[PDB]
mmCIF file of C-alpha atoms in Angstrom:
data_model
loop_
_atom_site.group_PDB
_atom_site.id
_atom_site.type_symbol
_atom_site.label_atom_id
_atom_site.label_comp_id
_atom_site.label_asym_id
_atom_site.label_seq_id
_atom_site.Cartn_x
_atom_site.Cartn_y
_atom_site.Cartn_z
ATOM 1 C CA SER A 3 35.952 -70.017 -128.048
ATOM 2 C CA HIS A 4 32.390 -70.123 -129.292
ATOM 3 C CA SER A 5 32.170 -69.983 -133.060
ATOM 4 C CA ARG A 6 29.615 -66.933 -133.606
ATOM 5 C CA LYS A 7 29.268 -67.880 -136.814
ATOM 6 C CA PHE A 8 25.548 -68.789 -136.841
ATOM 7 C CA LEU A 9 25.206 -64.919 -135.789
ATOM 8 C CA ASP A 10 26.320 -63.714 -139.451
ATOM 9 C CA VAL A 11 23.866 -65.893 -141.678
ATOM 10 C CA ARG A 12 21.691 -63.783 -144.131
ATOM 11 C CA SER A 13 20.631 -66.980 -145.987
ATOM 12 C CA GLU A 14 19.688 -70.446 -146.432
ATOM 13 C CA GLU A 15 22.250 -71.065 -148.457
ATOM 14 C CA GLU A 16 24.852 -69.714 -145.575
ATOM 15 C CA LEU A 17 22.754 -71.096 -142.710
ATOM 16 C CA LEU A 18 23.638 -74.795 -144.619
ATOM 17 C CA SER A 19 27.090 -74.265 -144.879
ATOM 18 C CA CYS A 20 27.473 -72.702 -141.357
ATOM 19 C CA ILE A 21 25.638 -76.213 -140.215
ATOM 20 C CA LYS A 22 28.191 -77.899 -142.539
ATOM 21 C CA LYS A 23 30.769 -75.888 -141.043
ATOM 22 C CA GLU A 24 30.707 -76.363 -137.487
ATOM 23 C CA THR A 25 30.470 -80.018 -138.650
ATOM 24 C CA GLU A 26 33.700 -80.537 -139.926
ATOM 25 C CA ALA A 27 35.675 -78.204 -137.634
ATOM 26 C CA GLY A 28 33.790 -81.266 -135.093
ATOM 27 C CA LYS A 29 32.123 -78.527 -132.937
ATOM 28 C CA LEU A 30 28.565 -79.880 -133.763
ATOM 29 C CA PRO A 31 27.884 -83.592 -134.191
ATOM 30 C CA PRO A 32 26.169 -84.884 -137.296
ATOM 31 C CA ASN A 33 22.662 -86.165 -135.696
ATOM 32 C CA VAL A 34 22.797 -82.506 -134.347
ATOM 33 C CA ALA A 35 23.735 -80.686 -137.045
ATOM 34 C CA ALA A 36 20.686 -82.969 -139.179
ATOM 35 C CA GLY A 37 18.639 -81.956 -136.220
ATOM 36 C CA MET A 38 19.050 -78.403 -136.592
ATOM 37 C CA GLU A 39 18.749 -78.359 -140.535
ATOM 38 C CA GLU A 40 14.909 -80.330 -139.660
ATOM 39 C CA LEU A 41 14.228 -77.777 -137.037
ATOM 40 C CA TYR A 42 15.182 -74.786 -139.527
ATOM 41 C CA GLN A 43 12.572 -75.984 -142.336
ATOM 42 C CA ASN A 44 10.047 -77.139 -140.206
ATOM 43 C CA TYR A 45 10.089 -73.683 -137.696
ATOM 44 C CA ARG A 46 10.181 -71.378 -140.903
ATOM 45 C CA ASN A 47 7.339 -73.321 -142.554
ATOM 46 C CA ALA A 48 5.187 -73.381 -139.648
ATOM 47 C CA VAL A 49 6.045 -69.608 -139.615
ATOM 48 C CA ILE A 50 5.154 -68.875 -142.942
ATOM 49 C CA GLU A 51 2.068 -70.795 -142.676
ATOM 50 C CA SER A 52 0.312 -68.593 -140.238
ATOM 51 C CA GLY A 53 0.189 -65.670 -142.804
ATOM 52 C CA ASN A 54 2.609 -63.531 -140.387
ATOM 53 C CA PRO A 55 3.693 -60.837 -142.732
ATOM 54 C CA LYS A 56 7.114 -60.686 -141.172
ATOM 55 C CA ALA A 57 7.397 -64.617 -141.415
ATOM 56 C CA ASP A 58 11.129 -64.177 -143.506
ATOM 57 C CA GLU A 59 12.440 -61.939 -140.369
ATOM 58 C CA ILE A 60 11.015 -63.226 -137.379
ATOM 59 C CA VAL A 61 12.434 -66.756 -139.199
ATOM 60 C CA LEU A 62 15.752 -65.329 -139.773
ATOM 61 C CA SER A 63 16.328 -63.725 -136.414
ATOM 62 C CA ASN A 64 15.084 -66.597 -134.530
ATOM 63 C CA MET A 65 16.524 -69.538 -136.157
ATOM 64 C CA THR A 66 19.666 -67.670 -136.256
ATOM 65 C CA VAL A 67 19.760 -66.918 -132.683
ATOM 66 C CA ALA A 68 18.630 -70.173 -131.819
ATOM 67 C CA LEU A 69 21.469 -71.946 -133.604
ATOM 68 C CA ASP A 70 23.981 -70.145 -132.234
ATOM 69 C CA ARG A 71 22.572 -70.521 -128.811
ATOM 70 C CA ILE A 72 22.604 -74.527 -129.557
ATOM 71 C CA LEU A 73 26.239 -74.757 -130.781
ATOM 72 C CA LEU A 74 27.101 -72.668 -127.984
ATOM 73 C CA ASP A 75 25.714 -75.437 -125.766
ATOM 74 C CA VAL A 76 27.172 -78.247 -127.601
ATOM 75 C CA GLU A 77 30.713 -76.589 -127.559
ATOM 76 C CA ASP A 78 30.471 -76.511 -123.276
ATOM 77 C CA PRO A 79 26.943 -77.825 -122.105
ATOM 78 C CA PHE A 80 25.140 -75.938 -119.255
ATOM 79 C CA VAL A 81 25.057 -77.876 -116.448
ATOM 80 C CA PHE A 82 21.851 -78.627 -114.781
ATOM 81 C CA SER A 83 21.588 -79.598 -111.378
ATOM 82 C CA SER A 84 18.393 -79.658 -108.718
ATOM 83 C CA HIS A 85 17.114 -76.261 -108.746
ATOM 84 C CA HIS A 86 17.813 -73.502 -112.119
ATOM 85 C CA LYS A 87 16.600 -70.268 -111.909
ATOM 86 C CA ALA A 88 15.943 -68.695 -115.435
ATOM 87 C CA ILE A 89 18.906 -67.272 -116.689
ATOM 88 C CA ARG A 90 17.845 -63.750 -118.032
ATOM 89 C CA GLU A 91 21.278 -61.766 -118.364
ATOM 90 C CA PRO A 92 23.713 -60.722 -120.538
ATOM 91 C CA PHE A 93 21.119 -62.989 -122.905
ATOM 92 C CA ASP A 94 17.434 -62.937 -121.297
ATOM 93 C CA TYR A 95 17.443 -67.301 -122.576
ATOM 94 C CA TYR A 96 13.801 -66.436 -121.010
ATOM 95 C CA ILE A 97 12.619 -63.764 -123.432
ATOM 96 C CA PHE A 98 14.414 -65.408 -126.314
ATOM 97 C CA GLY A 99 11.511 -68.828 -125.858
ATOM 98 C CA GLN A 100 8.879 -66.368 -125.292
ATOM 99 C CA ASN A 101 9.685 -64.884 -128.477
ATOM 100 C CA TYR A 102 10.226 -68.061 -130.031
ATOM 101 C CA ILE A 103 7.309 -69.875 -129.478
ATOM 102 C CA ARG A 104 5.678 -66.208 -130.028
ATOM 103 C CA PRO A 105 4.587 -66.822 -133.875
ATOM 104 C CA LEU A 106 3.398 -70.192 -133.467
ATOM 105 C CA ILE A 107 0.461 -69.189 -131.678
ATOM 106 C CA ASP A 108 -2.895 -68.105 -132.978
ATOM 107 C CA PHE A 109 -4.051 -66.319 -129.956
ATOM 108 C CA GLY A 110 -7.540 -65.720 -131.993
ATOM 109 C CA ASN A 111 -8.453 -69.293 -131.303
ATOM 110 C CA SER A 112 -6.417 -69.268 -128.189
ATOM 111 C CA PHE A 113 -8.355 -69.405 -125.040
ATOM 112 C CA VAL A 114 -8.113 -69.129 -121.149
ATOM 113 C CA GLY A 115 -10.289 -71.287 -118.489
ATOM 114 C CA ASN A 116 -10.950 -69.587 -115.570
ATOM 115 C CA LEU A 117 -8.467 -66.460 -115.120
ATOM 116 C CA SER A 118 -9.572 -65.428 -111.834
ATOM 117 C CA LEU A 119 -8.402 -68.064 -110.421
ATOM 118 C CA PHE A 120 -4.628 -67.056 -111.493
ATOM 119 C CA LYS A 121 -5.739 -64.253 -109.249
ATOM 120 C CA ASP A 122 -6.267 -66.266 -106.899
ATOM 121 C CA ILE A 123 -3.119 -68.377 -107.133
ATOM 122 C CA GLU A 124 -1.215 -64.649 -107.134
ATOM 123 C CA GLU A 125 -3.264 -64.065 -103.620
ATOM 124 C CA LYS A 126 -2.459 -66.986 -102.264
ATOM 125 C CA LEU A 127 1.568 -66.429 -103.082
ATOM 126 C CA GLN A 128 1.236 -62.611 -101.503
ATOM 127 C CA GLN A 129 0.048 -64.552 -98.006
ATOM 128 C CA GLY A 130 3.040 -66.555 -97.980
ATOM 129 C CA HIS A 131 1.609 -70.112 -99.213
ATOM 130 C CA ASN A 132 2.978 -72.529 -101.992
ATOM 131 C CA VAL A 133 0.601 -73.409 -105.056
ATOM 132 C CA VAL A 134 1.337 -76.249 -106.846
ATOM 133 C CA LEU A 135 -0.129 -77.210 -110.053
ATOM 134 C CA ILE A 136 -1.084 -80.476 -110.841
ATOM 135 C CA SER A 137 -1.023 -80.604 -114.776
ATOM 136 C CA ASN A 138 -1.009 -82.500 -117.895
ATOM 137 C CA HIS A 139 1.644 -81.620 -120.327
ATOM 138 C CA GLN A 140 1.983 -81.703 -124.286
ATOM 139 C CA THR A 141 4.904 -80.386 -125.719
ATOM 140 C CA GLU A 142 8.346 -78.884 -124.525
ATOM 141 C CA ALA A 143 7.222 -75.459 -124.983
ATOM 142 C CA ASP A 144 4.905 -76.246 -122.238
ATOM 143 C CA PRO A 145 6.535 -73.319 -120.295
ATOM 144 C CA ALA A 146 5.937 -70.695 -123.041
ATOM 145 C CA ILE A 147 2.445 -71.906 -123.626
ATOM 146 C CA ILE A 148 1.563 -71.033 -119.944
ATOM 147 C CA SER A 149 3.621 -67.422 -120.005
ATOM 148 C CA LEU A 150 2.439 -66.204 -123.620
ATOM 149 C CA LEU A 151 -1.527 -66.964 -122.616
ATOM 150 C CA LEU A 152 -0.710 -64.891 -119.315
ATOM 151 C CA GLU A 153 1.634 -62.292 -120.094
ATOM 152 C CA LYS A 154 -0.763 -59.514 -119.620
ATOM 153 C CA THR A 155 -2.962 -60.366 -117.107
ATOM 154 C CA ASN A 156 -0.623 -62.336 -114.561
ATOM 155 C CA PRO A 157 3.070 -61.525 -115.091
ATOM 156 C CA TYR A 158 4.141 -63.067 -112.137
ATOM 157 C CA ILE A 159 2.962 -65.949 -113.122
ATOM 158 C CA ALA A 160 4.497 -66.370 -116.317
ATOM 159 C CA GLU A 161 8.020 -65.099 -115.425
ATOM 160 C CA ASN A 162 8.205 -67.168 -111.652
ATOM 161 C CA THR A 163 6.803 -70.450 -112.183
ATOM 162 C CA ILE A 164 9.391 -73.173 -111.365
ATOM 163 C CA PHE A 165 8.722 -76.326 -113.547
ATOM 164 C CA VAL A 166 9.546 -80.317 -112.647
ATOM 165 C CA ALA A 167 11.281 -81.220 -115.201
ATOM 166 C CA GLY A 168 12.855 -84.545 -116.740
ATOM 167 C CA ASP A 169 16.067 -85.656 -117.469
ATOM 168 C CA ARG A 170 14.943 -86.470 -121.057
ATOM 169 C CA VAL A 171 14.408 -82.746 -122.092
ATOM 170 C CA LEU A 172 16.749 -81.258 -120.558
ATOM 171 C CA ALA A 173 19.330 -83.276 -122.339
ATOM 172 C CA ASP A 174 18.603 -82.033 -125.582
ATOM 173 C CA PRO A 175 20.665 -80.063 -127.438
ATOM 174 C CA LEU A 176 17.653 -78.512 -129.257
ATOM 175 C CA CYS A 177 15.705 -77.571 -126.219
ATOM 176 C CA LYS A 178 18.598 -76.288 -124.288
ATOM 177 C CA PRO A 179 18.856 -72.699 -124.778
ATOM 178 C CA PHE A 180 14.708 -72.876 -124.142
ATOM 179 C CA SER A 181 15.271 -74.954 -120.529
ATOM 180 C CA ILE A 182 17.927 -72.322 -119.679
ATOM 181 C CA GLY A 183 15.492 -69.604 -119.696
ATOM 182 C CA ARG A 184 13.221 -71.144 -117.196
ATOM 183 C CA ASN A 185 13.030 -72.014 -113.525
ATOM 184 C CA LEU A 186 13.300 -75.592 -112.639
ATOM 185 C CA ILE A 187 13.477 -78.009 -110.632
ATOM 186 C CA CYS A 188 15.619 -81.267 -112.287
ATOM 187 C CA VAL A 189 14.713 -85.024 -111.708
ATOM 188 C CA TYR A 190 16.067 -88.279 -113.489
ATOM 189 C CA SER A 191 12.572 -90.145 -114.531
ATOM 190 C CA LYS A 192 11.493 -93.272 -112.789
ATOM 191 C CA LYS A 193 10.799 -94.457 -116.557
ATOM 192 C CA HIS A 194 14.701 -94.100 -117.353
ATOM 193 C CA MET A 195 15.799 -94.427 -114.237
ATOM 194 C CA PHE A 196 16.898 -98.273 -114.956
ATOM 195 C CA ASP A 197 18.246 -97.825 -118.320
ATOM 196 C CA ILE A 198 21.546 -97.871 -117.382
ATOM 197 C CA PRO A 199 22.780 -99.645 -114.331
ATOM 198 C CA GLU A 200 26.223 -97.826 -113.879
ATOM 199 C CA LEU A 201 24.090 -94.163 -113.725
ATOM 200 C CA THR A 202 21.042 -95.560 -111.154
ATOM 201 C CA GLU A 203 22.694 -94.821 -107.872
ATOM 202 C CA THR A 204 23.944 -91.502 -109.248
ATOM 203 C CA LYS A 205 20.415 -90.396 -110.406
ATOM 204 C CA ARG A 206 18.847 -91.402 -107.564
ATOM 205 C CA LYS A 207 21.498 -89.044 -104.976
ATOM 206 C CA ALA A 208 20.564 -86.119 -107.282
ATOM 207 C CA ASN A 209 16.907 -86.768 -107.329
ATOM 208 C CA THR A 210 17.495 -87.172 -103.206
ATOM 209 C CA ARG A 211 18.827 -83.486 -103.427
ATOM 210 C CA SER A 212 16.459 -82.161 -105.498
ATOM 211 C CA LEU A 213 13.439 -83.190 -103.633
ATOM 212 C CA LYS A 214 15.590 -82.072 -100.896
ATOM 213 C CA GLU A 215 16.013 -78.286 -101.888
ATOM 214 C CA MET A 216 12.281 -78.526 -103.124
ATOM 215 C CA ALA A 217 11.379 -78.812 -99.344
ATOM 216 C CA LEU A 218 13.648 -76.510 -98.685
ATOM 217 C CA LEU A 219 11.977 -73.801 -100.589
ATOM 218 C CA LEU A 220 8.716 -74.457 -99.926
ATOM 219 C CA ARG A 221 9.495 -73.822 -96.014
ATOM 220 C CA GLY A 222 10.544 -70.325 -97.499
ATOM 221 C CA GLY A 223 6.497 -69.879 -98.481
ATOM 222 C CA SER A 224 5.402 -68.150 -101.877
ATOM 223 C CA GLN A 225 6.593 -71.131 -104.106
ATOM 224 C CA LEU A 226 4.831 -71.706 -107.397
ATOM 225 C CA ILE A 227 5.728 -75.091 -108.964
ATOM 226 C CA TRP A 228 4.067 -77.151 -112.060
ATOM 227 C CA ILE A 229 4.355 -80.513 -112.371
ATOM 228 C CA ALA A 230 2.995 -83.336 -114.680
ATOM 229 C CA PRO A 231 2.367 -86.286 -112.569
ATOM 230 C CA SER A 232 2.125 -88.380 -115.709
ATOM 231 C CA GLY A 233 5.756 -87.253 -116.411
ATOM 232 C CA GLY A 234 5.680 -87.562 -120.423
ATOM 233 C CA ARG A 235 3.908 -85.702 -123.038
ATOM 234 C CA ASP A 236 0.733 -86.966 -124.098
ATOM 235 C CA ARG A 237 0.179 -89.613 -126.976
ATOM 236 C CA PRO A 238 -2.705 -89.907 -129.197
ATOM 237 C CA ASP A 239 -4.421 -92.938 -128.798
ATOM 238 C CA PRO A 240 -2.445 -95.588 -131.193
ATOM 239 C CA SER A 241 -5.831 -96.512 -132.721
ATOM 240 C CA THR A 242 -8.264 -93.554 -132.605
ATOM 241 C CA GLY A 243 -5.657 -90.590 -132.577
ATOM 242 C CA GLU A 244 -7.266 -89.281 -130.074
ATOM 243 C CA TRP A 245 -5.441 -86.902 -127.385
ATOM 244 C CA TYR A 246 -6.219 -86.310 -123.971
ATOM 245 C CA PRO A 247 -4.274 -85.972 -120.660
ATOM 246 C CA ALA A 248 -2.207 -89.253 -119.567
ATOM 247 C CA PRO A 249 -2.744 -91.160 -116.662
ATOM 248 C CA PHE A 250 -1.087 -89.891 -113.703
ATOM 249 C CA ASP A 251 1.191 -90.936 -111.243
ATOM 250 C CA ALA A 252 -0.277 -91.474 -108.276
ATOM 251 C CA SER A 253 2.857 -91.694 -105.967
ATOM 252 C CA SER A 254 3.885 -88.268 -107.817
ATOM 253 C CA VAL A 255 0.653 -86.074 -106.263
ATOM 254 C CA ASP A 256 1.253 -87.808 -102.782
ATOM 255 C CA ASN A 257 4.721 -86.827 -102.660
ATOM 256 C CA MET A 258 4.264 -83.748 -103.469
ATOM 257 C CA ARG A 259 1.314 -83.341 -100.694
ATOM 258 C CA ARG A 260 3.679 -84.774 -98.164
ATOM 259 C CA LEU A 261 6.109 -82.212 -98.867
ATOM 260 C CA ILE A 262 3.975 -79.615 -98.748
ATOM 261 C CA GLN A 263 2.827 -80.965 -95.376
ATOM 262 C CA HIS A 264 5.931 -81.338 -93.771
ATOM 263 C CA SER A 265 6.928 -77.584 -95.007
ATOM 264 C CA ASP A 266 4.868 -76.380 -92.506
ATOM 265 C CA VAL A 267 3.658 -73.434 -94.556
ATOM 266 C CA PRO A 268 -0.182 -73.731 -96.102
ATOM 267 C CA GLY A 269 0.131 -75.231 -99.544
ATOM 268 C CA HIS A 270 -2.858 -75.756 -102.224
ATOM 269 C CA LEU A 271 -2.307 -77.684 -105.341
ATOM 270 C CA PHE A 272 -4.925 -76.531 -108.536
ATOM 271 C CA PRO A 273 -5.963 -78.942 -111.538
ATOM 272 C CA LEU A 274 -4.310 -77.485 -114.519
ATOM 273 C CA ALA A 275 -5.354 -78.171 -118.063
ATOM 274 C CA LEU A 276 -2.906 -77.828 -121.248
ATOM 275 C CA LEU A 277 -3.893 -77.648 -124.653
ATOM 276 C CA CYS A 278 -1.519 -77.407 -127.567
ATOM 277 C CA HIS A 279 0.122 -80.586 -128.814
ATOM 278 C CA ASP A 280 -0.859 -79.920 -132.333
ATOM 279 C CA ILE A 281 2.042 -76.959 -131.995
ATOM 280 C CA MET A 282 4.785 -78.856 -131.332
ATOM 281 C CA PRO A 283 4.054 -83.146 -130.846
ATOM 282 C CA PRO A 284 5.837 -85.515 -129.737
ATOM 283 C CA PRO A 285 6.744 -88.079 -132.567
ATOM 284 C CA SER A 286 3.651 -90.936 -132.913
ATOM 285 C CA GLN A 287 2.912 -93.421 -135.094
ATOM 286 C CA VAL A 288 -0.532 -93.430 -135.374
ATOM 287 C CA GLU A 289 -0.298 -89.944 -136.574
ATOM 288 C CA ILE A 290 2.659 -90.800 -139.174
ATOM 289 C CA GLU A 291 -0.192 -93.381 -140.186
ATOM 290 C CA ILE A 292 -2.863 -90.887 -140.309
ATOM 291 C CA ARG A 296 4.718 -82.236 -139.413
ATOM 292 C CA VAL A 297 6.723 -81.459 -135.713
ATOM 293 C CA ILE A 298 5.752 -77.772 -135.606
ATOM 294 C CA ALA A 299 2.658 -75.911 -136.207
ATOM 295 C CA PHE A 300 0.353 -72.842 -136.063
ATOM 296 C CA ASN A 301 -2.283 -73.530 -133.983
ATOM 297 C CA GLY A 302 -4.605 -72.320 -131.195
ATOM 298 C CA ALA A 303 -3.680 -73.116 -127.836
ATOM 299 C CA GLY A 304 -5.565 -73.311 -124.353
ATOM 300 C CA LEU A 305 -5.070 -73.014 -120.731
ATOM 301 C CA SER A 306 -7.495 -73.729 -117.786
ATOM 302 C CA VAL A 307 -7.071 -74.089 -114.152
ATOM 303 C CA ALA A 308 -10.361 -75.110 -111.735
ATOM 304 C CA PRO A 309 -10.615 -75.073 -107.769
ATOM 305 C CA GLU A 310 -8.281 -77.166 -105.462
ATOM 306 C CA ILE A 311 -9.688 -80.471 -104.737
ATOM 307 C CA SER A 312 -10.506 -81.326 -101.221
ATOM 308 C CA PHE A 313 -8.293 -83.740 -99.691
ATOM 309 C CA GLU A 314 -9.453 -84.127 -96.347
ATOM 310 C CA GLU A 315 -13.036 -84.981 -98.213
ATOM 311 C CA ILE A 316 -11.155 -87.981 -100.231
ATOM 312 C CA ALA A 317 -9.170 -88.677 -97.016
ATOM 313 C CA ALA A 318 -12.522 -89.409 -94.604
ATOM 314 C CA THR A 319 -14.358 -91.075 -96.998
ATOM 315 C CA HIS A 320 -11.658 -93.955 -98.046
ATOM 316 C CA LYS A 321 -10.475 -97.226 -95.869
ATOM 317 C CA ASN A 322 -6.794 -96.741 -96.165
ATOM 318 C CA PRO A 323 -3.882 -95.093 -97.269
ATOM 319 C CA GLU A 324 -3.734 -96.547 -100.451
ATOM 320 C CA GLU A 325 -6.983 -95.812 -101.698
ATOM 321 C CA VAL A 326 -6.885 -92.398 -100.098
ATOM 322 C CA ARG A 327 -3.424 -91.214 -102.719
ATOM 323 C CA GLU A 328 -5.435 -93.467 -105.764
ATOM 324 C CA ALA A 329 -8.694 -91.204 -105.102
ATOM 325 C CA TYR A 330 -7.566 -87.847 -104.434
ATOM 326 C CA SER A 331 -5.100 -88.361 -107.782
ATOM 327 C CA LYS A 332 -7.459 -89.279 -109.961
ATOM 328 C CA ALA A 333 -10.065 -86.478 -108.857
ATOM 329 C CA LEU A 334 -7.498 -84.239 -109.887
ATOM 330 C CA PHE A 335 -6.773 -85.646 -112.963
ATOM 331 C CA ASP A 336 -10.743 -85.687 -113.467
ATOM 332 C CA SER A 337 -10.615 -82.363 -113.218
ATOM 333 C CA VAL A 338 -7.631 -81.782 -115.488
ATOM 334 C CA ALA A 339 -9.421 -84.297 -118.237
ATOM 335 C CA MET A 340 -12.699 -81.809 -117.979
ATOM 336 C CA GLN A 341 -11.354 -78.712 -118.680
ATOM 337 C CA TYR A 342 -9.151 -80.542 -121.334
ATOM 338 C CA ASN A 343 -12.519 -81.211 -123.176
ATOM 339 C CA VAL A 344 -13.550 -77.521 -122.808
ATOM 340 C CA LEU A 345 -10.221 -76.302 -124.338
ATOM 341 C CA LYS A 346 -10.695 -78.649 -126.988
ATOM 342 C CA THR A 347 -14.233 -78.453 -127.821
ATOM 343 C CA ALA A 348 -13.201 -74.107 -128.021
ATOM 344 C CA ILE A 349 -10.472 -74.541 -130.180
ATOM 345 C CA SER A 350 -10.605 -78.180 -132.421
ATOM 346 C CA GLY A 351 -14.292 -77.892 -131.739
ATOM 347 C CA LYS A 352 -14.293 -74.497 -133.256
ATOM 348 C CA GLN A 353 -16.921 -73.127 -130.626
ATOM 349 C CA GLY A 354 -14.647 -70.376 -128.791
ATOM 350 C CA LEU A 355 -16.374 -68.833 -125.655
ATOM 351 C CA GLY A 356 -19.485 -70.929 -126.764
ATOM 352 C CA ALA A 357 -17.635 -73.720 -125.312
ATOM 353 C CA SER A 358 -17.987 -72.253 -121.707
ATOM 354 C CA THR A 359 -19.575 -74.273 -118.944
ATOM 355 C CA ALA A 360 -20.443 -73.231 -115.284
ATOM 356 C CA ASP A 361 -17.072 -75.060 -114.284
ATOM 357 C CA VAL A 362 -14.852 -73.304 -116.628
ATOM 358 C CA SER A 363 -14.942 -69.958 -117.993
ATOM 359 C CA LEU A 364 -13.715 -69.022 -121.071
ATOM 360 C CA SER A 365 -11.647 -65.730 -122.278
ATOM 361 C CA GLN A 366 -9.387 -64.524 -124.236
ATOM 362 C CA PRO A 367 -6.952 -61.761 -122.330
ATOM 363 C CA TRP A 368 -4.543 -60.664 -124.800
#
């Protein structure tokens, strides 16, 4: 039976004592207990540093509920398979991840690129078409960056986007409550497929099942799916420290395009850029060389779909077409990303807008 002791915590001393007690009962592995203490301190620090006047209340509330939900999953892990629908009841995991990430976003220094295209995307969905957002990936909070930035203007996208998500993030005890509250297509990454030879067959069968269910969803129409063809989160250049979208896997863009073609329903792929690594960056040696959670502006942009036909008509074979189409999507993502960068880290705000990227603050 679930220990609800984290919900009785009213102080940092009780928090640490609770962590100790759950570990001593064997209900929390020592490395997970340690990760929980680091998480607490880092979340606390970022919220206090934002200047938020309700910092102490937000931290106590979000962190005691986060620890309770992390322990709940450790006691009996939620099993993810193929398509996962966000859990909204009795405990709304979606709204929990939204409220958990809210205080880390500096909305005054956050921007949306080409807001009107998100309305275009909703129209296409209303026509029964499917839309795939071909994006870069920066943090495990990416779904909340998208949902929070668009919650006022595009609540439909905020609540119904489906994220193609890899096994590494879905297995992490600290991220599980967040993941449970999102719509997902769960896949085993190519990167880790061969790490454990005794699991490869199983992962491949599950990947086929996930693809099959995604194809079935597409046949039904009106699906909005996000996928980062790079797989992983962007990393800073190991020498310069510069962050920008990681290389795409051109086969991943091709596989999505072809599933759309066989679904017999009109489908659209739009290049999407996300800028939020400062809020919850992946670990990196150059960052040590030159904080796991921070308050910072976030950016989100979308640009028109790339003409696949124009590329197929001007390239000599299948491989060259695949590479050029993936590169054209990637080139758009990187272009939008630099405009977001100039607006936020460059401090130009709306003055970073260009002919192709029009910024706004829809909140």
